[PDB]
């Protein structure tokens, strides 16, 4: 049948597109002590398992397409799901937008695996100290809130502080013109919608979304001071559907601006 050939073509295309393999992080006691290493090792393990599953999936589908394999029950529901163009249930292990089709999911998975490969290569080249200095897209990660928690743990353990007494400061600077403080972590890919941020100062704009160049998460000791009237708390959603709440940032609005207008207009920060 024609659909059989089309499925063969798309499976071969995706097999070509998706990277080959993912390398696990080498275990070490000093690395075990570091929390960032633990989080990134968990992410690498999950990503590698999912990548192996998807690759073996595509290989089995291609082999069925040649005709040397019989369609088992799992393969049959798999092929039905593929031809109907919806996301397979087994493939989707991390939180995903509801309406995203298979092709977009495969492209996103390829991007995530590329980021994970870069992260693993950087970790292997150096160690936890180099692992702290990696600019990581929150959308690319499977569990970004785990990354936020890992950064908090690293800051607390480095300076012998308690976790509960640390608060989050966000500094939005360009990638080139950024300073990597011991308590600062580079985060890329955050998109600001409904407003534009300049010199860490929010301004209301009619643009659909403004891309933040490089968001720096700085954990500082709780100053125990009331927040100023010109500060605004913005949600950070995982995707455009706004179904996942990763964390809340605090930004300083510009002069003459009204935070109530920021709340009404649905200004938010998106990982993707």
């Amino acid at each position: 049948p024609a659909w059989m050939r089309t499925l063969h073509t798309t499976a071969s295309n995706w097999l070509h597109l998706i990277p080959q393999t993912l390398s696990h992080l080498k275990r070490t006691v000093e690395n075990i002590k570091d929390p960032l290493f633990r989080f990134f090792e968990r992410e690498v393990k999950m990503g590698a398992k999912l990548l192996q599953d998807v690759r073996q999936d595509l290989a089995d589908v291609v082999q069925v397409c040649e005709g040397k394999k019989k369609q088992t029950n799992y393969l049959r529901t798999l092929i039905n799901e593929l031809v109907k163009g919806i996301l397979p249930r087994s493939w989707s292990h991390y939180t995903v937008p509801a309406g995203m089709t298979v092709i977009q999911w495969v492209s996103d998975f390829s991007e995530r695996i590329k980021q994970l490969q870069n992260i693993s290569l950087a970790a292997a080249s150096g160690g936890a100290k180099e692992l702290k200095n990696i600019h990581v897209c929150l959308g690319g990660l499977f569990v970004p809130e785990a990354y936020i928690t890992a950064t908090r743990q690293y800051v607390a353990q480095a300076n012998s502080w308690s976790l509960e007494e640390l608060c989050l400061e966000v500094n939005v600077t360009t990638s080139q013109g950024a300073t990597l403080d011991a308590c600062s972590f580079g985060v890329t890919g955050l998109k600001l919608q409904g407003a534009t941020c300049n010199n860490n100062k929010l301004s209301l704009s009619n643009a659909i979304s403004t891309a933040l160049p490089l968001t720096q998460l700085r954990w500082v000791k709780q100053t125990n001071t009331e927040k100023k009237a010109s500060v605004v708390t913005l949600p950070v959603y995982l995707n455009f559907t706004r179904a996942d709440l990763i964390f809340t940032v605090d930004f300083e609005i510009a002069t003459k601006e009204d935070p109530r207008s920021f709340y009404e207009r649905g200004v938010a920060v998106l990982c993707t």
Partner: protein, 1478 residues
């Protein structure tokens, strides 16, 4: 009757009848008052039991009536019940009034005397002191806003808040010291409510509210009590926002206090506004957010019940409808849980019911139709439903919604830590809550892990208890050293982060897997930096653990020594026992959970002087209805269940079991089917709810533990509600098992001493091989690398090896007994023990794998051992044996050469001994001597059943009962077998099950031990049931719920590999006890021996051919070898072979050689070729395969019979028939064709007339069918496309040869029982009447696998014991007796007539299966016939024969230039008719 005093409507017809009949019996009315009233467990009366003096709670707190109600003055039940409730409400109101006066005296005071305050608290109930505090605070603040009503004035709210603060100070002072638990609960509730009051008052202070009518104050829940109001109902009104509620004033007793988080306050606001608008609320949200607790607290604050129904998948209606209508009449609230989990029909029905109830409630703003009855719904009714993400469409309008998305865990921890008396509660809470978030997120996900809010509450309560214990210890130390005692000073200098860390560790470390403990400590360092805890070792408990381990032959250690991990696990179990009432040891089978808790119980009994008793209940073996209790749907009598019975026995305290430490352990798998009733016990309330409506309080000394090997199918509700101890397999190291085995061998004898001395020498010999990294350890490690037909468990192999070493010691003792003059010396004993140990490792570690893996293990052990081994160049050690003289002797010597009789050729009884048979008999006797159940697993055929049956009949004192397990097998089969062959007897130890006949060891042989299907939760009831008796040595008689000890009963099983279709792998907990031996297909040598014996028996009829027995058998086994090798199962699902084919082959050769008095070797070759073609050629599909078989049979005959002529002995038309002559002789196909056309015409004349055309394929198939119908146990599997003529040919052969045809008339209603009945009728007509039966079967007739199992048993054994039981069995034996009398045989005893009936059935009945192209076992029991489809030749013959009447003769027709030649044998000139048919 129920219309008046609607409060008692809550109970059902059962309790209504009970209270009507026993109205004078007030002592039996306490169960009712438990059912309806709130805190009440019983009503206090005098010795006369005639006047209701007072009321009591289930905890022990009681109220005294100001004016007690005299039942004598009001004999009517309803009148005095109404008087009792009215007086209870009035007493609650008066007590509330005077308590409010007392607390007002307390209020507006600079300082409070702790003694007066504690006296006021002790005088009163927890609910009442909480209400008094609420009223006092509300009145004081109301007067205060009245004062500032002028505005811009001084603030007495500061004074009120300061008063609340000083009350908080004295409260935190009081709870630090030791208090009674009831006073502790009252103090905790007071602290929680006062903390909430302080918070809201500080909020009012910050908001600078100066008007009493300002909404910010109006939103807070206000209580307004009016002492002068005549009606006690109207005295206190609970107003909040615009809603006004009247107090329920029902005695709530003592219940857990819900902290007043902002989410809870918002819930109160929304729910009160909804109730004001006369429609309930629907607080949806995710799991573990306290929505149900919010409903409970809102109801309790208003003095009303809620009944939180549990809406699981298995949900009731009749009792559900009863509790609903009772609630509607009484007016007490009702709440739901997990509503969306209900079934769609269930959901719609409940939605309609609550829709009617809500519509009645709205119309009240009065009776409604409920269960075809009128129900008076009180105005104060409310109903709430909690969802997990929506409301049904008919309810979306009638019901307000609320988002219980998350609870405030930080404030919950702060308030509850302050309740325990902790100082610096804010810091501790803000540390602990994120720590539990990290544990939920960062730690590896596991089935048994749980870090919910309930776990946090348990941790904080345990922390409070540990702080109290530390304070008490410091106080005792200060009493001993010095005299200065002051609670405040010891409280001040007491570390608290250390105490919290100690509680957190004690609670969570036991449930952590091996690799998570460092992660937990890293998390603790991250959250609690620089502060650490040190585990306080239990010195006395460690000493007594050592003593009990010594007594029980268990190895014991401390820290890093052998057994240190196990000892630490036992101590962790002890701590979990201390801090929890519900435990759960989770770990793979073989980690020592059972022995861990048993040793802990024994050590505790020897420590505290409190004797411990343990009840082991297997939930899966017993039905849930019997497990919890049976409520008769019609007679309405309640029969208490097993768990219910043991709980009631504990409660009654007949023999001081309350003083005892009693542990109920649920040894067996867990699923969300029965544990849903236990969820009400594992929680804080701890009560045994019963369908009858009875409630049983859980005693403090009762502990519930579920020794579950895994938690995959367990719901998170159960996991969150009980403590967890993780028992990894690393806990029980192999050296520990070795030491336990050696200690038990050295201490206890096998018989129940010379044999004890023999055991000691044997252990001394094998000690070098059992050490760490010894021979056995390395052999086991390598054996784990191999592949086994069943999943490999370390403890299974170790137990089998230990049992077989026990048999080695028994053999040594027997040798010493049989040679009294020369007992075996030390050197010979050492040689024998070493050789037996090597052989035992060989046959135990790889006793359940193929021969190649056995050879791999043999070569490995030969490489790694120093024990002497046989020097055979290629023969493996396994085929050798260890003689009593300590020498390696081949098993071949033990194999004899018997000669079976002629009339017994290939009879079911005969079992020709061989290498496989003799080795399996030896191992079977070995594992039977220790009475260890064993399973014989192997491919279809292979003689697993005959080997087992012959070995069992060999020993005289062991009787055999065969049990054919089906796909629908249930333990009731085993109970029925026990009833038939055993009986219950009362003994001083207890009730004992033993066989009726004395001095016999009954074996319940299970033919298919893995056939029964597992439930939806992956558990087989029969398997767990058999395991329960295998391990505990008994079970519970469900008739009276009594432990029954098994005596002289043991189990033996057989099965096929689990990879085969329809086979479910056995549980590891069951496999651990049962050694498994793999009965592969007998080797070419074994087949040669057995069928050479069969041939030598067969050929004695004709003496001139006796010399050709050996070459005939050799040719047979060789051809069968290539047949098996070539026609593999991968080509077709039915391409299987076994020795059963050879048995059929020899049986057919016998049956066709018996009529012929003399016969030259050419005829024997011809008959051998005919049977080979009928067995290994017709089952094929492709013509190339058939040509291959013909060529190979030609080559085999030429090779093994060279001095013969191929034309005569192997003429191509090998067609044998009994139709023409009297004997079964070859005949030319032309006479066959003519005679069978004549018989077809007679078939038209007599039976149904449909035109049948005769093509050569029908000739061959009719010949095959006739040949099989002639043979005994002739069962045909007609495999072919529909309409080919399978059924018609079968009927034609049956009619021709005289067998009466029989077909099933199956319809959509045709259940199993009809099939068993029809099989019964067929069996009677074939065995009891000596009348042959042709059983036509088609796969369309098969409706379930059970039919296939019954037919398979019928094909294999010749009959099935299942059909004929009791009266039917007696009727069958009457028929068989009369039939034997008619035939001429006199038989009396049951067994002889049954055997004669079985012989008649196997000789007479012929069942033919027709399927359209599948258990391989079914294929092996029939001779598979390939009908296929009509070929081109066949279709052409049908066409010509049918269209011969029409005249298609056209001389004008001229042959084409090219003629289509689809017909293979078309004549060279097509005429018109052949062209048309083509």
């Amino acid at each position: 009757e129920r219309s008046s005093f609607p409060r008692f409507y809550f109970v059902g017809d059962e309790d209504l009848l009970e209270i009507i009949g026993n109205s004078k019996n007030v002592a039996k009315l306490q169960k009712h008052f438990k059912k309806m009233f709130a805190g009440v467990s019983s009503i206090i009366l005098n010795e006369d039991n005639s006047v209701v003096l007072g009321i009591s709670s289930r905890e022990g707190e009681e109220v005294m009536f100001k004016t007690p109600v005299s039942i004598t003055e009001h004999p009517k039940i309803n009148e005095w019940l109404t008087l009792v409730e009215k007086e209870m409400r009035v007493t609650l109101a008066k007590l509330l009034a005077e308590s409010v006066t007392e607390v007002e005296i307390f209020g507006k005071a600079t300082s409070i005397d702790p003694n007066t305050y504690i006296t006021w608290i002790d005088k009163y109930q927890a609910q009442l002191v909480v209400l008094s505090a609420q009223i006092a605070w509300s009145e004081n603040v109301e007067t205060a806003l009245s004062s500032m009503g002028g505005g811009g004035d001084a603030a007495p709210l500061h004074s009120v808040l300061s008063n609340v603060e000083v009350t908080l100070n004295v409260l935190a002072d009081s709870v630090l010291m030791e208090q009674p638990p009831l006073r502790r609960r009252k103090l905790e509730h007071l602290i929680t409510e006062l903390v909430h009051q302080r918070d809201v008052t500080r909020s009012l202070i910050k908001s600078k509210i100066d008007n009493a009518k300002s909404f910010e104050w109006l939103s807070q829940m206000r209580f307004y009590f009016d002492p002068k109001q005549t009606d006690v109902l109207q005295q206190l009104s609970i107003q909040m926002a615009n809603a006004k509620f009247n107090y329920g004033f029902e005695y709530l007793g003592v219940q857990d206090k819900l902290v007043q988080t902002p989410l809870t306050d918002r819930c109160y606001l929304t729910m009160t506004q909804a109730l004001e608008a006369r429609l309930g609320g629907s607080p949806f949200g995710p799991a573990g957010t306290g929505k149900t607790e919010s409903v409970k607290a809102l109801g309790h604050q208003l003095g009303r019940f809620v009944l939180v129904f549990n809406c699981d998948e298995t949900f009731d209606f009749q009792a559900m409808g009863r509790i609903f209508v009772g609630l509607c009449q009484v007016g007490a609230w009702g709440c739901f849980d997990e509503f969306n989990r209900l079934e769609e029909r269930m959901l719609s029905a409940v939605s309609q019911q609550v829709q009617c109830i809500q519509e009645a409630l709205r119309e009240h703003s009065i009776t409604c139709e409920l269960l075809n009855k009128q129900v008076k719904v009180s105005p104060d009714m409310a109903i709430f439903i909690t969802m997990n993400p929506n409301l049904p469409d008919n309810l979306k309008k009638l019901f307000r919604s609320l988002a219980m998305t998350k609870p405030d865990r930080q404030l919950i921890a702060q308030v509850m830590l302050y309740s325990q008396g902790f100082r610096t509660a804010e810091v501790l809470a803000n540390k602990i809550v994120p720590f539990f978030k990290l544990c939920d997120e960062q730690l590896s996900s596991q089935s048994h892990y749980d870090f919910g809010l309930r776990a946090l509450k348990s941790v904080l309560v345990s922390a409070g208890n540990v702080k109290r214990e530390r304070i008490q210890k410091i106080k005792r130390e200060k009493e001993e050293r010095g005299e200065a005692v002051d609670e405040g000073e010891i409280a001040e200098n007491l570390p608290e982060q250390e105490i919290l860390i100690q509680s957190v560790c004690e609670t969570m470390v036991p449930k952590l897997v091996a690799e998570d403990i460092p992660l937990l400590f890293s998390l603790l360092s991250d959250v609690f930096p620089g502060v650490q805890y040190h585990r306080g070792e239990m010195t006395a408990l460690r000493e007594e653990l050592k003593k009990v381990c010594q007594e029980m032959y268990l190895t014991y250690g401390d820290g890093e020594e052998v057994g240190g991990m196990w000892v630490e696990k036992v101590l962790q179990l002890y701590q979990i026992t201390q801090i929890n009432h519900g435990l759960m040891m989770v770990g793979p089978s073989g980690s020592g959970k059972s022995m861990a808790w048993r040793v802990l119980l024994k050590a505790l009994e020897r420590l505290e002087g409190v004797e411990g008793v343990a009840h082991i209940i297997d939930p899966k073996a017993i039905s849930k209805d019997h497990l919890y209790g049976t409520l008769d749907p019609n007679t309405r009598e309640w029969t208490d269940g097993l768990f219910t019975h043991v709980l009631r026995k504990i409660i009654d305290s007949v023999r001081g079991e309350l003083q005892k430490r009693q542990w109920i352990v649920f040894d067996g798998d867990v699923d969300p089917e029965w544990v849903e009733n236990l969820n009400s016990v594992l929680d804080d309330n701890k009560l045994l709810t019963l369908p009858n409506g009875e409630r049983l309080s859980l005693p403090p000394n009762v502990r519930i533990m579920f020794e579950v090997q895994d938690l995959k199918y367990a719901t998170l509700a159960t996991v969150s509600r009980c403590g967890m101890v993780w028992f990894s397999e690393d806990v029980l190291s192999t050296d520990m098992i070795f030491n336990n085995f050696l200690a038990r061998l050295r201490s206890i004898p096998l018989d129940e001493s010379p044999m004890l001395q023999i055991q000691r020498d044997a252990a001394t010999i094998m000690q070098p091989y059992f050490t760490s990294n010894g021979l056995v350890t390395k052999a086991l490690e390598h054996a784990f690398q191999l592949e086994h037909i069943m999943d490999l468990t370390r403890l299974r192999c170790l137990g089998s090896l230990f049992s077989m070493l026990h048999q080695a010691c028994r053999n040594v003792a027997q040798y010493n007994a049989n040679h009294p003059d020369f007992p075996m010396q030390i050197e010979q004993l050492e040689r024998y023990i070493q050789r037996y140990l090597v052989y035992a490792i060989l046959w135990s570690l790889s006793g359940d794998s193929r021969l190649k893996m056995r050879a791999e293990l043999g070569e490995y052990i030969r490489r790694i051992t120093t024990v002497p081994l046989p020097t055979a160049p290629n023969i493996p050690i396994i085929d050798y044996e260890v003689s009593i003289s300590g020498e390696w002797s081949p098993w071949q010597a033990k194999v004899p050469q018997i000669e079976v009789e002629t009339h017994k050729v290939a009879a079911p009884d005969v079992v020709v001994p061989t290498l496989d048979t003799v080795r399996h008999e030896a191992l079977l006797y070995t594992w039977l001597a220790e009475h260890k159940p064993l399973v014989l697993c192997g491919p279809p055929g292979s003689g697993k059943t005959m080997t087992l049956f012959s070995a069992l009949r060999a020993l005289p004192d062991m009787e055999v009962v065969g049990l054919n397990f089906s796909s629908a097998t249930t333990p009731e089969l085993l109970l029925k077998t026990f009833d038939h062959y055993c009986e219950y007897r009362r003994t001083p130890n207890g009730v004992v099950l033993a066989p009726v006949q004395l001095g016999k060891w009954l074996v319940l042989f299970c033919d298919e031990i893995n056939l029964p299907d597992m439930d939806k939760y992956g558990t087989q009831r029969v398997i767990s049931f058999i395991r329960q008796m295998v391990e505990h040595g008994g079970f519970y008689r469900t008739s009276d719920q009594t432990w029954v000890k098994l005596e002289r009963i043991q189990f033996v099983g057989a099965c096929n590999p689990p990879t085969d279709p329809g086979r479910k792998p056995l549980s590891h907990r069951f496999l651990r006890h049962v050694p498994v031996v793999y009965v592969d297909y007998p080797g070419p040598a074994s087949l040669t021996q057995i069928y050479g014996t069969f041939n030598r028996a067969m050929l004695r009829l004709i003496p001139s051919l006796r010399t050709y027995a050996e070459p005939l058998t050799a040719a047979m086994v060789e051809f069968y070898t290539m047949s098996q090798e070539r026609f593999t199962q991968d080509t077709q699902p039915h391409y299987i072979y076994s020795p059963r084919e050879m048995t059929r082959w020899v049986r057919g050769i016998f049956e066709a050689l018996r009529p012929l008095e003399t016969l030259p070797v050419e005829g024997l070759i011809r008959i051998w070729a005919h049977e080979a073609l009928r067995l290994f050629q017709d089952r094929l599909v492709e013509d190339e395969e058939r040509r291959w078989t013909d060529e190979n049979i030609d080559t085999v005959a030429l090779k093994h019979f060279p001095n013969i002529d191929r034309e005569k002995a192997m003429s191509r038309p090998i067609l044998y028939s009994n139709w023409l002559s009297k004997d079964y002789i070859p005949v030319d196909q032309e006479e066959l064709r003519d005679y069978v056309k004549a018989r077809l015409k007679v078939f038209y004349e007599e039976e149904l007339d449909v035109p049948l055309v005769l093509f050569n394929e029908v000739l061959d198939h009719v010949l095959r069918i006739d040949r099989i119908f002639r043979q005994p146990q002739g069962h045909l599997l007609l495999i072919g496309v529909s309409g080919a003529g399978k059924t018609t040919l079968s009927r034609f052969v049956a009619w021709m040869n005289g067998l009466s045809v029989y077909q099933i008339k199956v319809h959509r209603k045709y259940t199993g029982e009809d099939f068993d009945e029809d099989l019964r009728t067929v069996l009677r007509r074939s065995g009891c009447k000596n009348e042959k039966i042709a059983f036509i079967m088609d796969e369309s007739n098969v409706l379930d696998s059970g039919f296939l199992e019954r037919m398979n048993t019928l094909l294999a054994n010749g009959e099935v014991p299942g059909l004929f039981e009791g009266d039917e069995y007696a009727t069958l034996m009457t028929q068989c007796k009369e039939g034997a009398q008619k035939e001429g045989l006199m038989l009396d005893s049951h067994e002889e007539l049954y055997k004669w009936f079985t012989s008649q059935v196997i000789r007479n009945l012929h069942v033919v299966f027709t399927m359209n192209p599948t258990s391989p076992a079914l294929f092996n029991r029939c001779v598979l016939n390939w009908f296929g489809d009509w070929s081109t030749e066949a279709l052409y013959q049908v066409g010509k024969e049918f269209t011969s009447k029409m005249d298609l003769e056209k001389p004008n027709y001229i042959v084409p230039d090219y003629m289509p030649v689809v017909y293979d044998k078309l004549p060279q000139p097509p005429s018109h008719r052949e062209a048309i048919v083509n």
